[PDB]
């Protein structure tokens, strides 16, 4: 045996019943006694992995192959961040033994008219109501532009947690971060799309609040926003509606 065993799927909890995300910096992760570990000056720590959906790893951080082996084996994910933004989305297994979501996602995105229909659905979901959308081709580019038009710190932080939790639920449902209906030309299209639906209603309010209140500080408001909004379920709902 020479070790413990790897997890299964019926000993794993869904992402609807989990914590959202953790942060880590100036540390170094490892494996020990069939477990995970963290080590800063303040002292050792440990980390449950079957009760999280995202890890974030900041500067001065190190990590070892035998930890990744373990985290991935649960359904969790890894994300390296910094002063410039997120980077190096990593992930392991997916908590879905069937591929219906990917099949239908491809059946859609192959054709172009269905792609356009779903993109219009999302364009009208981006805005406060239903009849506020516009039935045009590219005037919605200027629409989104005008809608976009010591605070970028909170902007980023929230955007990072958002991207990560999306990535997690996407791979746990069975979708693909590449088969996107907008933003295409990369491998994170479905992610960069699904995240703009909530960037507006989440990032900016508390970002401005913080930037006004000058005297880390954001990640409590971000988690409270998650717990209240119920993102982890509303997103699954949006997706089952967007693909049917």
């Amino acid at each position: 045996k020479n070790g413990a065993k790897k997890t299964s799927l019926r000993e794993l909890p869904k992402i609807s019943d989990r914590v959202s995300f953790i942060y880590v910096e100036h540390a170094k992760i490892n494996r020990v006694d069939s477990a995970i570990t963290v080590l800063d000056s303040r002292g050792t720590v440990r980390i449950p992995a079957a009760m999280i959906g995202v890890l974030l790893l900041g500067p001065g951080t190190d990590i070892s192959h035998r930890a990744v082996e373990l985290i991935g084996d649960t359904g969790t994910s890894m994300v390296w961040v910094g002063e410039r933004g997120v980077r190096q989305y990593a992930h392991g297994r997916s908590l879905a033994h069937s591929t219906k979501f990917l099949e239908k996602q491809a059946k859609l995105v192959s054709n172009s008219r269905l792609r356009l229909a779903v993109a219009r659905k999302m364009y009208q979901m981006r805005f406060p109501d239903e009849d506020v959308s516009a039935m045009t081709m590219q005037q919605l580019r200027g629409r989104e532009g005008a809608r976009v038009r010591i605070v970028n710190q909170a902007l980023s932080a929230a955007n990072v947690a958002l991207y990560g939790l999306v990535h997690s639920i996407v791979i746990a449902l069975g979708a693909s971060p590449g088969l996107g209906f907008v933003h295409t030309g990369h491998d994170l299209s479905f992610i960069y799309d699904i995240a703009d639906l909530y960037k507006a209603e989440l990032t900016i309010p508390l970002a401005f609040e913080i930037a006004a209140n000058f005297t880390k500080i954001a990640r409590q408001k971000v988690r409270d926003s998650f717990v209240d909004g119920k993102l982890i379920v509303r997103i699954v709902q949006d997706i089952q509606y967007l693909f049917d």
């Binding site: 006694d33 069939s34 477990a35 449950p48």
Partner: protein, 92 residues
Amino acid sequence: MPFTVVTLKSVPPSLRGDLTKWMQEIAIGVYVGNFNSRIREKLWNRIQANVGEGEATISYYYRNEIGYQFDMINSQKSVVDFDGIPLVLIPN
């Protein structure tokens, strides 16, 4: 989504650090965690097996006349049925 508590005594270190993936440590041999029935009814068959000679106990939130249930493996503390209620025993 009940509350679950697990105790471990005299077990291999390949069960004292694995269980720290679901649960969390507050003291020695004391592991506390919140989750539902399907997960724990698997964790218990996982700990019945790879424990060895040591002992372990589980107690979860429920709805009975007192408010919880529990079970044991290889522990000398038995369990009696006091006409509906479970009460721990200590034989001679």
